């Protein structure tokens, strides 16, 4: 499954761009698993695409208000910070070229 690999990747990004606090792999999975259940993420890689970021935020916000469940929103806040960091701080395609180069 794409799923447990995406947890790895995200967990990597947070250790690097996640200043201070960082979330647990349990917490990241919880976020992801919910997002799949709620029908937002069709595949867990779709979360890297920025198209999805505003929608997610909105939806996890609703959840904190309506159902009083904010744990996953907190995760997403940390996580998104890392994604944006990473997008600004690097050239996207060059960083990918590097990874596939190592692949052999």
UniProtKB/Swiss-Prot annotation:
Protein localization: Virion
Protein name, as recorded: Matrix protein p19
Source organism (scientific name): Rous sarcoma virus subgroup C (strain Prague)
